[PDB]
Each structure stands twice: as C-alpha cells, then as structure tokens.
C-alpha cells in the first residue's frame, strides 16, 4: 500500500517543476470570468498535497484521478496555445510519463 510513496515522489516532482506555476494554488473564480460556470470539479496541486498530508488517499488510483482532473480542467478552460494551456500540456505529459515508468 506504499504506492502512496510514489504519489509523494511524483507530487514533489510536479510541485517543483518549472511548468507547475498555474497549478500550485486553486484558481480564484473571482479573478477568472466564467471559471465557476465551466469547471465543475476544480483541482490543483496544493489541494492534492493537503489531501495526501491528512491521509485522505486510499489508493494510488484516486491520486491519479485528481492529477488527471487538474489537466482535464486545464484543457477544458484554456486554449492549447495559451500560456496556462502550454504549461498544462508540459505538466500532463510529465505526469503520464512518470506514472507509467512506475506502473
Ligand atoms: C489563467 C489563470 C489560471 C491559472 C493561473 C495561476 S497563476 C496565473 N497567472 C498569474 C500571473 N500571470 C498571469 C496569470 C493570471 O491570469 N492570474 C490571475 C488568475 C489567477 C486566479 O487564481 N494563472 N491556473 C489555471 C489552471 C488557470 C485557468 C484560468 O485555468
Ligand atoms: Mg500515453
């Protein structure tokens, strides 16, 4: 049940990644017009860190579900050629590759 250890490794690496800047904190819907209306389930790296710190993950699969939610939301709201969108593609490819070179 120490897939949570690899969750720790991968989350540390995403948190320190250069392209992680759009995802370190929750999006503030007061500052982003339309975000609340379009994104039903917001997610971000600090929320995953908090959930992991309090033992809120029962398996690596739901951790991965939150991670993929970050980048699904990113691609849903932001254009692929937007700055946040580009960072999201870099981060998504990073997560998929790291997650697969363990499982
Ligand atoms: C595009 C908003 C965004 C971010 C995000 C996090 S910091 C940031 N920066 C700050 C400095 N340069 C401009 C840009 C910005 O516009 N900051 C105001 C909005 C911050 C509300 O929290 N952008 N991350 C995701 C997943 C986003 C969206 C819309 O999906
Ligand atoms: Mg693939």
Swiss-Prot record:
Transmembrane segments: none annotated. It is found in: Nucleus, Nucleolus. It comes from the Eukaryota. Deacetylation by SIRT1 in late S phase enhances pRNA-binding, allowing de novo DNA methylation and heterochromatin formation. Acetylation is high during S phase and declines to background levels in late S phase when the silent copies of rRNA genes are replicated. Ubiquitinated. Deubiquitinated by USP21 leading to its stabilization. Expressed at moderate levels in most tissues analyzed, including heart, brain, placenta, lung, skeletal muscle, kidney and pancreas. Residues 1-102 form the Bromo domain. Belongs to the WAL family. The bromo domain and the PHD-type zinc finger recognize and bind histone H4 acetylated on 'Lys-16' (H4K16ac). These 2 domains play a central role in the recruitment of chromatin silencing proteins such as DNMT1, DNMT3B and HDAC1. Component of the NoRC-1 ISWI chromatin remodeling complex at least composed of SMARCA1 and BAZ2A/TIP5, which regulates the spacing of histone octamers on the DNA template to facilitate access to DNA. Within the NoRC-1 ISWI chromatin remodeling complex interacts with SMARCA1; the interaction is direct. Component of the NoRC-5 ISWI chromatin remodeling complex (also called the NoRC nucleolar-remodeling complex), at least composed of SMARCA5/SNF2H and BAZ2A/TIP5, which regulates the spacing of histone octamers on the DNA template to facilitate access to DNA. Regulatory subunit of the ATP-dependent NoRC-1 and NoRC-5 ISWI chromatin remodeling complexes, which form ordered nucleosome arrays on chromatin and facilitate access to DNA during DNA-templated processes such as DNA replication, transcription, and repair. Both complexes regulate the spacing of nucleosomes along the chromatin and have the ability to slide mononucleosomes to the center of a DNA template. Directly stimulates the ATPase activity of SMARCA5 in the NoRC-5 ISWI chromatin remodeling complex. This is Bromodomain adjacent to zinc finger domain protein 2A. It comes from Homo sapiens. The chain holds residues 1796 to 1898 of 1905 of the full protein.
